[PDB]
Design a protein around this ligand. Sequence first.
Ligand SMILES: OC[C@H]1O[C@@H](O[C@H]2[C@H](O)[C@@H](O)[C@H](O)O[C@@H]2CO)[C@H](O)[C@@H](O)[C@H]1O
Length: 139
Amino acid sequence: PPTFNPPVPYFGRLQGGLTARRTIIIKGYVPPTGKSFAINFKVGSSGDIALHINPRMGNGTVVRNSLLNGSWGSEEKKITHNPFGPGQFFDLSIRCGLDRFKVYANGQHLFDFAHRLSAFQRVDTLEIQGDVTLSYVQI
Ligand SMILES: OC[C@H]1O[C@@H](O[C@H]2[C@H](O)[C@@H](O)[C@H](O)O[C@@H]2CO)[C@H](O)[C@@H](O)[C@H]1O
């Protein structure tokens, strides 16, 4: 709920839903002893996950997926850089476009994720969980 130094798990509501052109900023720190953390764009408290972003420190992967109508779909993992190294600070910018989420990290394009939940407007919950320290979250 706060903007600065919010504790994990973070739960924040997107007023008027996830509007087209809406940008979410997440500034954080990856703990050296952490294993994984997740950023979830969700429909209402404990419903569908339109976009699940899950950096995993053991294998250095950045897994993207959707949890829709009870099931995970296919993972998207391709990147040209991993900014979530142990003990690193990162600055994420997440923009909801008409056909895809566009995600930048430290100013550099990280991934696009095409919408699988088509009506992206339905997303009203930003969730952040796991092994991550947050300095700033702007919704
Ligand atoms: O796909 C996101 C989802 O992954 C789950 O783990 C997967 C694992 O990544 C995959 O290699 C295997 O085929 O299936 C596992 C179970 O679905 C995580 O458990 C879950 O939290 C999400 O991160």
